Coordinates of C-alpha atoms and ligand atoms in Angstrom, one line a residue:
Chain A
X6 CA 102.3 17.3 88.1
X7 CA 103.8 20.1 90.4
X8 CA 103.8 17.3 92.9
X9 CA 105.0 17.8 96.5
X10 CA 107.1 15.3 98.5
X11 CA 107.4 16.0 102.4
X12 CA 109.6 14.0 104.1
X13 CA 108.9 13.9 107.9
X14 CA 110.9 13.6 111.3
X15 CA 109.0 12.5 114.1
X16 CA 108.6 10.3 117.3
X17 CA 104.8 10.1 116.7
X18 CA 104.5 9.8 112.8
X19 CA 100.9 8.3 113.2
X20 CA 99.8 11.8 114.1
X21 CA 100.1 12.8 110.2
X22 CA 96.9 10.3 109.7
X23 CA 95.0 13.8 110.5
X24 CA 96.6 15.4 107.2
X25 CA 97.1 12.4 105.2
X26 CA 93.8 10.3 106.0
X27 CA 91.2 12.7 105.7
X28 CA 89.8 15.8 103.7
X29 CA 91.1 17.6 101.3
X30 CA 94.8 16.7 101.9
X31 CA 93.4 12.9 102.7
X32 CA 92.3 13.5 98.9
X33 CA 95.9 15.4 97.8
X34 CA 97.3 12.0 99.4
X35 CA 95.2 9.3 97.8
X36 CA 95.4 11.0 94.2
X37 CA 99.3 11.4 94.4
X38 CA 99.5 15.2 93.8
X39 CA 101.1 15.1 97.8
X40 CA 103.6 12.1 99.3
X41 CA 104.2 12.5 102.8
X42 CA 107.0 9.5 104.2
X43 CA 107.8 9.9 107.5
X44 CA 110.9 8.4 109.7
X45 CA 110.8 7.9 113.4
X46 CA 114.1 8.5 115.3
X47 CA 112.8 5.6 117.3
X48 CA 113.7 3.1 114.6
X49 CA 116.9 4.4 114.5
X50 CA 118.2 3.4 117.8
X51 CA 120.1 0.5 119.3
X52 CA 119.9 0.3 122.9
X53 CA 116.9 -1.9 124.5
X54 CA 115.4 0.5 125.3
X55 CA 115.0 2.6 122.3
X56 CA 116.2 5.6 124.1
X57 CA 115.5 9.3 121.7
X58 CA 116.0 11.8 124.7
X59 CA 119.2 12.9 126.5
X60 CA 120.1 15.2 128.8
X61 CA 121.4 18.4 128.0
X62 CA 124.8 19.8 128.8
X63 CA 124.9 22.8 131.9
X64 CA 121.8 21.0 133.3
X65 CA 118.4 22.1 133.8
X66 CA 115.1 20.4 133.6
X67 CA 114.5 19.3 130.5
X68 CA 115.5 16.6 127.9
X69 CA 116.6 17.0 124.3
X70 CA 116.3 14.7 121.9
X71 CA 119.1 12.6 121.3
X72 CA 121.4 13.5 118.6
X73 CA 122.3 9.9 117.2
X74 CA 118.8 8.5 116.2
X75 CA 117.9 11.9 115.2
X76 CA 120.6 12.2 113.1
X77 CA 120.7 9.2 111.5
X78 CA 116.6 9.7 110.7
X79 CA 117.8 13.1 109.0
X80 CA 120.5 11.5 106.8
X81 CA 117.8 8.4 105.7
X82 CA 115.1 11.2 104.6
X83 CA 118.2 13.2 103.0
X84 CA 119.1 10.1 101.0
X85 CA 115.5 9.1 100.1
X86 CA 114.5 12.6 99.1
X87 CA 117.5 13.0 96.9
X88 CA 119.0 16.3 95.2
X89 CA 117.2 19.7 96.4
X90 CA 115.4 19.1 99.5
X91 CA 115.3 21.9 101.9
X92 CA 115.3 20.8 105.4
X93 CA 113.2 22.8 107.7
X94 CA 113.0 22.6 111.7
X95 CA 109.8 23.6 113.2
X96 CA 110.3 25.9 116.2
X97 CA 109.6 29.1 118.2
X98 CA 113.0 30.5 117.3
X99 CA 112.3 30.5 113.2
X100 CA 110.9 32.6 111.2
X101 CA 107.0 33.4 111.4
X102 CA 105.0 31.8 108.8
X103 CA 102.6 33.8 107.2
X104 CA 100.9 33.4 103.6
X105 CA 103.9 35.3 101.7
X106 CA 106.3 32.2 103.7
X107 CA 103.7 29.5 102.4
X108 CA 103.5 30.7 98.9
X109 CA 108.1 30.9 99.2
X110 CA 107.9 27.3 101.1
X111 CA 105.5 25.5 98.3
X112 CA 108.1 26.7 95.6
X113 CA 110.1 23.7 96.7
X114 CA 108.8 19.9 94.9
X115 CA 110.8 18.3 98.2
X116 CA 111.0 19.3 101.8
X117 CA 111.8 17.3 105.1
X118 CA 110.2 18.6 108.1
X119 CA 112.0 18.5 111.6
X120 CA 109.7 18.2 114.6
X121 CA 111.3 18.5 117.7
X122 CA 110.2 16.9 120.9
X123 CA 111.7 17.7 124.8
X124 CA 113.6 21.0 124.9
X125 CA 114.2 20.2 121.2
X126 CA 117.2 20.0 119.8
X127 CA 120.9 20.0 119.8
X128 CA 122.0 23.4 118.2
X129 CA 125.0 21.9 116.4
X130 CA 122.4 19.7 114.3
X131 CA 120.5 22.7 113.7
X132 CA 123.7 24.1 112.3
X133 CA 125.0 21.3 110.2
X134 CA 121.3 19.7 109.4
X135 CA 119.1 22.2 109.1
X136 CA 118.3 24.9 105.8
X137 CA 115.8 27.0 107.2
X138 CA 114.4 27.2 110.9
X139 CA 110.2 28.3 110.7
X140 CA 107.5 29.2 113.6
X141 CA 103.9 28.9 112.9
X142 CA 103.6 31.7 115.2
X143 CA 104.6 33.2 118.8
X144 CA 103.6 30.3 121.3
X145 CA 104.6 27.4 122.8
X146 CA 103.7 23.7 121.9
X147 CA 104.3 20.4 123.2
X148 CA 106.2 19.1 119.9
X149 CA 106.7 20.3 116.0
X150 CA 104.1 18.0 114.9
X151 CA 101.3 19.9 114.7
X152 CA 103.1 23.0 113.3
X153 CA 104.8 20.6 110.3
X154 CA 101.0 19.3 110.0
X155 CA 100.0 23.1 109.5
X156 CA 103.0 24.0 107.1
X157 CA 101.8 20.8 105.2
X158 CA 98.2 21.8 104.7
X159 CA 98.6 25.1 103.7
X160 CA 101.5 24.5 101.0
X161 CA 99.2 21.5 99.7
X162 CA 96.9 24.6 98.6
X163 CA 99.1 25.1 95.9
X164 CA 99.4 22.3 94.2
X165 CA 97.7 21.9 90.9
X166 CA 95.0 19.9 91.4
X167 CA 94.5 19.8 95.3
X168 CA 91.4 22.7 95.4
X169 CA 88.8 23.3 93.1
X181 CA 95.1 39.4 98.4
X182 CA 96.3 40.8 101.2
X183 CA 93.0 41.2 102.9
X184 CA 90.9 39.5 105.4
X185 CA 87.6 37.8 103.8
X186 CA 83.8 39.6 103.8
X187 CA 80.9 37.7 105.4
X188 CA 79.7 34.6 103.7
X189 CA 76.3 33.9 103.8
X190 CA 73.8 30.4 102.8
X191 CA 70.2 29.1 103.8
X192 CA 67.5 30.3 105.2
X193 CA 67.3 33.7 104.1
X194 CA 66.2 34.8 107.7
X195 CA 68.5 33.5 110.9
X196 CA 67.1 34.4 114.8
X197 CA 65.9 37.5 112.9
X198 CA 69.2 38.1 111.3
X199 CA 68.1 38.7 107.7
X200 CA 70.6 38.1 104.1
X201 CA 71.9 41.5 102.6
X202 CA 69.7 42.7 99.8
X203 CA 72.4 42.8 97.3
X204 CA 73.3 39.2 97.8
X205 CA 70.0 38.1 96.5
X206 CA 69.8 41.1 93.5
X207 CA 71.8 39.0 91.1
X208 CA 73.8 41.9 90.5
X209 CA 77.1 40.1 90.0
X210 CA 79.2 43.7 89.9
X211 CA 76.9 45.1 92.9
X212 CA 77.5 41.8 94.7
X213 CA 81.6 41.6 93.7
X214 CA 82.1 45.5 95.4
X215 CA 80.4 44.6 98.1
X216 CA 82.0 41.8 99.0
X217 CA 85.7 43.8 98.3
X218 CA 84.2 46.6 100.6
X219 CA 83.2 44.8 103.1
X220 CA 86.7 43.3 103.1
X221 CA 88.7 46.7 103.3
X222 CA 86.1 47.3 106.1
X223 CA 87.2 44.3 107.8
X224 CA 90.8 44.5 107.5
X225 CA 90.5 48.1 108.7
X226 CA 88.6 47.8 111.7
X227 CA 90.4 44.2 112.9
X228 CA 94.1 44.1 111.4
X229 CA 94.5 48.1 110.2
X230 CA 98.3 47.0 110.0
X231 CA 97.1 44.8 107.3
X232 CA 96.0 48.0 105.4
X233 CA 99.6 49.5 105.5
X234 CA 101.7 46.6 103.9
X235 CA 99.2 46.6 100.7
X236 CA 99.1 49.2 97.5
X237 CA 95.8 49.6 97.1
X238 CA 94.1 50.0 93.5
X239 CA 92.1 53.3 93.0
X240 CA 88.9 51.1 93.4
X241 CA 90.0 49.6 96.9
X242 CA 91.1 53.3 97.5
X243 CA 87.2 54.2 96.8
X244 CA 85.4 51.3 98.6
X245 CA 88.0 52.1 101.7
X246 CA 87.1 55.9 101.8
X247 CA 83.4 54.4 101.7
X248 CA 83.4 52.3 104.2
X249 CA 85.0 54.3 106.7
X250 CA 82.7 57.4 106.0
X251 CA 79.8 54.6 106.4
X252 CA 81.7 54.0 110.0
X253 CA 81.9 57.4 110.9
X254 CA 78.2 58.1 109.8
Chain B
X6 CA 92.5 19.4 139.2
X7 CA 92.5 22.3 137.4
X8 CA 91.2 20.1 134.4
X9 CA 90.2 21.4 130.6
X10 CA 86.9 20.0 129.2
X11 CA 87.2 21.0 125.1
X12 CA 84.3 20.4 123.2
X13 CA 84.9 20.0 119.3
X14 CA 82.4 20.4 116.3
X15 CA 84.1 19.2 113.0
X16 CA 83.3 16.8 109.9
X17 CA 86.7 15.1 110.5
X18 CA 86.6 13.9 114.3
X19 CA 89.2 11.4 113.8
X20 CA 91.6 14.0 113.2
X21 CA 91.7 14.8 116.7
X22 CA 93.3 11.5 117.5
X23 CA 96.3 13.3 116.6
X24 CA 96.6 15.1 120.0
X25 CA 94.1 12.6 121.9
X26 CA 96.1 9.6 121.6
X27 CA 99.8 10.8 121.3
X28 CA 102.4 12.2 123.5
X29 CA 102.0 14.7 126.0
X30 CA 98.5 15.4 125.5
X31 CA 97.6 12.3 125.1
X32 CA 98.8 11.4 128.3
X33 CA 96.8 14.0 129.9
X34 CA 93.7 12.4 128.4
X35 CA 94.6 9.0 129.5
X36 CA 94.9 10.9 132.9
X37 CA 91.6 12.6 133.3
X38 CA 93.7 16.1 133.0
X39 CA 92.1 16.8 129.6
X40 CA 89.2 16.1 128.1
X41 CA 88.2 16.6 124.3
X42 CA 84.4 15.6 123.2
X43 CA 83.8 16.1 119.3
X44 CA 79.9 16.3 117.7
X45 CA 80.1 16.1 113.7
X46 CA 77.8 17.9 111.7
X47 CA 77.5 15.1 109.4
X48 CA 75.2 13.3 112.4
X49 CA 72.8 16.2 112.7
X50 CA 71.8 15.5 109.0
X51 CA 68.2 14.5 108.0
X52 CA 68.5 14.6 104.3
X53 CA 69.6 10.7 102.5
X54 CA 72.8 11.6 101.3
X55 CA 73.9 13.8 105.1
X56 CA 74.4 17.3 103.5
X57 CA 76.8 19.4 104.8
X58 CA 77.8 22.3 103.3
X59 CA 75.3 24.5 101.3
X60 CA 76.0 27.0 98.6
X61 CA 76.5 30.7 99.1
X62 CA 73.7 33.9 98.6
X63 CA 75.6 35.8 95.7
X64 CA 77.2 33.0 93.9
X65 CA 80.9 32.2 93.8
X66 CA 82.6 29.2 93.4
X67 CA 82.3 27.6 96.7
X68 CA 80.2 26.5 99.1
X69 CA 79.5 27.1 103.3
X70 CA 78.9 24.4 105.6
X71 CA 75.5 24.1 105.9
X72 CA 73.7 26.3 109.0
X73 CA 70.9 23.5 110.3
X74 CA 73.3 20.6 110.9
X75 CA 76.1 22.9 112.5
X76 CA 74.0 24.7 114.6
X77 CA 72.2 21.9 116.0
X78 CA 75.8 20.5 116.2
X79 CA 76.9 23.6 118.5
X80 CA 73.5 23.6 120.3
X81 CA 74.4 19.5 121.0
X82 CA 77.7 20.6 122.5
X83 CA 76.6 23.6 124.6
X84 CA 73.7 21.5 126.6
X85 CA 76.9 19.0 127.5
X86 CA 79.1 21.9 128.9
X87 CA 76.6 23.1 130.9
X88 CA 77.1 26.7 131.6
X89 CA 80.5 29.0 131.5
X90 CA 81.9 27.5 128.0
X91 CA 83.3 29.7 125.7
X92 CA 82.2 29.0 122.1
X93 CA 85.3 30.5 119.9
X94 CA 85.4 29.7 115.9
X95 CA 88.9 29.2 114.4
X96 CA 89.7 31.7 111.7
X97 CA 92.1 34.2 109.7
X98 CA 89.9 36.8 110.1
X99 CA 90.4 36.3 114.6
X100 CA 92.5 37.6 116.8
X101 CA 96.2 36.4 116.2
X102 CA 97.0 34.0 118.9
X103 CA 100.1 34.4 120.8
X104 CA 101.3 33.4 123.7
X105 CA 99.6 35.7 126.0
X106 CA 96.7 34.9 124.5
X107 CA 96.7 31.1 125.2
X108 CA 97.6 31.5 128.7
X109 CA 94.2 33.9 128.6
X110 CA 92.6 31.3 127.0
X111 CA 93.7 28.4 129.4
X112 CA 91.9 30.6 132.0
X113 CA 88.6 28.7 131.0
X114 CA 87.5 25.4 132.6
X115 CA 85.3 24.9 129.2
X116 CA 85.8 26.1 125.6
X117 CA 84.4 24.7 122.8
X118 CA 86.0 25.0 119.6
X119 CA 84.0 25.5 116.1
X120 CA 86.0 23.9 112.8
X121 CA 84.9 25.4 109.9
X122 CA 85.2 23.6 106.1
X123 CA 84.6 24.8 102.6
X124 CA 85.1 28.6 102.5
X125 CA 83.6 28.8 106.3
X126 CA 80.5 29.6 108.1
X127 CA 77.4 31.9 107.7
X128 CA 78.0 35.5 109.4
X129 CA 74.9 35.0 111.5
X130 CA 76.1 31.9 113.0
X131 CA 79.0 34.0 114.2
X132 CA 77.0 36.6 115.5
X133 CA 74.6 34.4 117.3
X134 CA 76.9 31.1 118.6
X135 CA 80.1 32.6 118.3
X136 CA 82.1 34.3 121.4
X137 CA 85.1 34.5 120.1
X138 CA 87.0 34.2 116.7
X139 CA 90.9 33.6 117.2
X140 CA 93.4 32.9 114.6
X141 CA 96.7 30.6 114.8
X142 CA 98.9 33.2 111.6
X143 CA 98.1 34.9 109.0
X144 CA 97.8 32.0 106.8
X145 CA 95.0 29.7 105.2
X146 CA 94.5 26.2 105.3
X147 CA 91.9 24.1 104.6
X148 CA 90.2 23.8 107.5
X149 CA 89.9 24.5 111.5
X150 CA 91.0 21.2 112.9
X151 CA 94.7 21.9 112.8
X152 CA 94.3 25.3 114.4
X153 CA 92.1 24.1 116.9
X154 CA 94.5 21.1 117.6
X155 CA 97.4 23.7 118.0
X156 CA 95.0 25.4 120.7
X157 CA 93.9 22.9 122.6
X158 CA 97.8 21.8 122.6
X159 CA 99.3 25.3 123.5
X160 CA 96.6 26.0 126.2
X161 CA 97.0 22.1 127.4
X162 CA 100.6 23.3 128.9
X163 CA 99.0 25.1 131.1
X164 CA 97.1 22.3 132.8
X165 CA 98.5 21.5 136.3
X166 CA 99.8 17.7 136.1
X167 CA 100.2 18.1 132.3
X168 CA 104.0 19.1 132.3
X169 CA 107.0 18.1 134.3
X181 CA 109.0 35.5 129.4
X182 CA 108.8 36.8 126.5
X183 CA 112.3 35.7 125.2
X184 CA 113.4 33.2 122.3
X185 CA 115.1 30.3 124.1
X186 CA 119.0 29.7 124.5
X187 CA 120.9 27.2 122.5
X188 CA 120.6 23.8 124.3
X189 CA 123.6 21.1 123.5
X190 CA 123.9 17.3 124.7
X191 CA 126.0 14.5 123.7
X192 CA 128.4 13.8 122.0
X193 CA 130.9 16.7 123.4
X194 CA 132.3 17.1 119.7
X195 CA 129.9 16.6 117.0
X196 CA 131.4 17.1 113.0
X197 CA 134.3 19.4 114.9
X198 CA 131.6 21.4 116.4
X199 CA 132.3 21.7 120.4
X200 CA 129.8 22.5 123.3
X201 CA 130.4 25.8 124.9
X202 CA 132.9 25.3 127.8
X203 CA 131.1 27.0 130.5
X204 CA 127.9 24.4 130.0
X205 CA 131.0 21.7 131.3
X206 CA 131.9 24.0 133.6
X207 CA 129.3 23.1 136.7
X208 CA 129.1 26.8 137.6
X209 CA 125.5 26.9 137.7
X210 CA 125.5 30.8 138.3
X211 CA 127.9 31.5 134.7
X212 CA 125.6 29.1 132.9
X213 CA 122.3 31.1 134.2
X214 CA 124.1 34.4 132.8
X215 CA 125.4 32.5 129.4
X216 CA 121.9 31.7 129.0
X217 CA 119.9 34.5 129.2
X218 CA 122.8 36.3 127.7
X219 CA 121.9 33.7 124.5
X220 CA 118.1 34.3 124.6
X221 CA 118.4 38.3 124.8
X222 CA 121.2 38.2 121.9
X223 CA 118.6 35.9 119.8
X224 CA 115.8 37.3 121.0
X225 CA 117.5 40.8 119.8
X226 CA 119.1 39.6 116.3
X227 CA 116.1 37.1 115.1
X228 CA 112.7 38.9 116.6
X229 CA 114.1 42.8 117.7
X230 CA 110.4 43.8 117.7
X231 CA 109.7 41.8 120.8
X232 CA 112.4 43.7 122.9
X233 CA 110.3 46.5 122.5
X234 CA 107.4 45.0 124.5
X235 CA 109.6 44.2 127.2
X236 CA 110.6 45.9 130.2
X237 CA 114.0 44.5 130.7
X238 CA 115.9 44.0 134.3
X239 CA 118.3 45.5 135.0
X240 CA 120.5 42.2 134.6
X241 CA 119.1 41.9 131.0
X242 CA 119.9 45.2 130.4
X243 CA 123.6 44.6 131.1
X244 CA 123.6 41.3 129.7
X245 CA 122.0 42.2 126.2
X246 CA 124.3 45.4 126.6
X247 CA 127.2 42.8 126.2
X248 CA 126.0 40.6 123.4
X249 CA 125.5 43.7 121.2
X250 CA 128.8 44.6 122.1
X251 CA 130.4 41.5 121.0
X252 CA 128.8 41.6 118.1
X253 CA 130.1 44.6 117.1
X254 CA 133.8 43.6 117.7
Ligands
4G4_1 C1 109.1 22.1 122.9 N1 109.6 23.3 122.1 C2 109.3 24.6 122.6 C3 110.3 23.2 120.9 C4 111.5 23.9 120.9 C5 112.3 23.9 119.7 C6 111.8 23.2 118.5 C7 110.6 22.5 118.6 C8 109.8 22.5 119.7 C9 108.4 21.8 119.8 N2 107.4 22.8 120.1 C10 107.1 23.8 119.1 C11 107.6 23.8 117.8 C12 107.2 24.9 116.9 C13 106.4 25.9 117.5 C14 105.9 27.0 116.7 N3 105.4 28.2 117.3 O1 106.1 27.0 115.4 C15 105.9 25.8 118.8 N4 106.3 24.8 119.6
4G4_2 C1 88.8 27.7 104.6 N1 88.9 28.9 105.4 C2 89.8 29.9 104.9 C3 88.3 29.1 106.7 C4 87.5 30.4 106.7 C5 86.9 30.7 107.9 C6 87.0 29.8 109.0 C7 87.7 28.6 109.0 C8 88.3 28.3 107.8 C9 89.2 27.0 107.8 N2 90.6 27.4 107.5 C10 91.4 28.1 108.4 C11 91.0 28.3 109.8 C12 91.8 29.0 110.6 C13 93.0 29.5 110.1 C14 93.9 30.3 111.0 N3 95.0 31.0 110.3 O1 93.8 30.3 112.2 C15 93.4 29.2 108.8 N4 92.5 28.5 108.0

């Protein structure tokens, strides 16, 4: 339907077994509603030793990954994928994902994900290879597997089919009704359903306030958030 | 050495192969530098059909994992680490990891790591098993195994044996010297390893300042990247 198509980069494919084998985007995977196909420099290299690093220009410690294998895996997925596939490379240096990002990212029906290895990668194929360069967040990682593996599961939210606000989600709360002591809120157990739905949005204006308050200042709040806010914070200060 | 043990409670174990089996951490598990245990929930089950999730106090449309089967599951896991393990649960609603906070993390000889499913766990659970609840971005997947893999990766670095400043990194080139007319900057040919040190901090600071110009403001620059960044803004105003 509003299928997704994710080409992948990568010297250790067989890692994507954890997105594609199991759960809910094992399920995405089996039904069709996600493809992931990946391509593995490796396989594109000629020596006999199936050389991917290199060293880089200037010196230093480090590898890079070595442009020709890489390359030629980019221009394989770029010819499977077809017309209007945005190429993304997984690093430190992009921009940070967050859920505004994941909502722009699963607009796309194909992407191919780049996941650096080494140092990473030659800035020239970032400039003639890449569309758009994306961090899953400020630290450091031994490859861009598991950040493409992230990016991946949370655009697979948004397909039709895969599943069943601004602010950071109230308490949940199951069996037994009593916990070490710890007892369920009344309110959940009135059947109320309008006692029970403010609640819940109170108690998530009271978390986002006392956790993330810079949350709070990106939103617009509705008079009844307004209300429940006010609330909660008097409630605080009481 | 200064070795990790990580224990792990999820319903998807296997996914964990992903960093246990694969690259640079899974070379540290081969070595004996990192250890990763995983308990499922699913085996502390009693009921026919292994039950594990349970259905929320106030209705809504999904459901919780289950509180006997994961808490026995956490209880499992404690007795093996014995004592000074830091239970943390991996959630949007934690602290947003970053790169100080992994290296405060990797401070810990023991963590275990608590994956929740479905639309999480039950507040008390938190409050009672719980230390602490850390987030990898401001984004929601569909479950905590990628964010604890990402973790137990990003603290992994920190591992003597594991391996061979607050700035994004330079621009790194290798081979070829021309790639589709682009050329590698002359001074990385140039063997003066004092001009390529300057080039590229020079590169990190004018990256660091056109990309991600909120993290200069937590940095207390040198006086070299003072005069350095100095420059770049300079050229880039010419
Ligand atoms: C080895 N490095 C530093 C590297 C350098 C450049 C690209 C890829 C890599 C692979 N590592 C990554 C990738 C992404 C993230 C992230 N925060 O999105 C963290 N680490
Ligand atoms: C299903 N949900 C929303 C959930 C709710 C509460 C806990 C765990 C989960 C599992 N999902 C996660 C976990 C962590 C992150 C993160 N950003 O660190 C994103 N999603």
């Amino acid at each position: 339907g509003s299928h997704m198509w994710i080409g992948v980069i990568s010297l250790f494919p067989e890692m994507f077994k954890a997105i594609t084998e199991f759960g809910v985007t094992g399920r995405a995977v089996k039904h069709n509603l996600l493809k992931v196909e990946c391509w593995n420099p490796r396989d594109f290299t000629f020596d006999k030793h199936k050389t991917v690093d290199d060293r880089p220009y200037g010196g230093g410690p480090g590898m890079l990954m070595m442009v020709q294998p890489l390359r030629d895996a980019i221009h394989t997925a770029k010819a499977a994928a077809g017309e209007g596939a945005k190429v993304i490379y997984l690093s430190p240096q992009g921009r940070k994902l967050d859920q505004g990002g994941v909502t722009e990212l699963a607009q796309n029906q194909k992407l191919i994900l780049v996941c650096g290895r080494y140092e990473g990668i030659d800035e020239r194929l970032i400039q003639t290879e890449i569309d758009e360069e994306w961090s899953i967040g400020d630290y450091v990682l031994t490859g861009g597997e598991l950040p493409a593996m992230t990016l991946i599961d949370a655009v697979a939210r948004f397909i039709p089919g895969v599943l069943g606000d601004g602010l950071l989600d109230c308490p949940h709360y199951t069996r037994p009704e009593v916990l070490e002591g710890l007892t369920v809120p009344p309110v959940l157990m009135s059947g109320h359903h309008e006692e029970i739905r403010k609640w819940r949005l109170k108690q998530s204006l009271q978390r986002t306030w006392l956790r993330r308050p810079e949350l709070l200042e990106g939103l617009a709040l509705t008079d009844e958030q307004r209300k429940l806010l006010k609330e909660a914070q008097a409630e605080h200060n009481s």
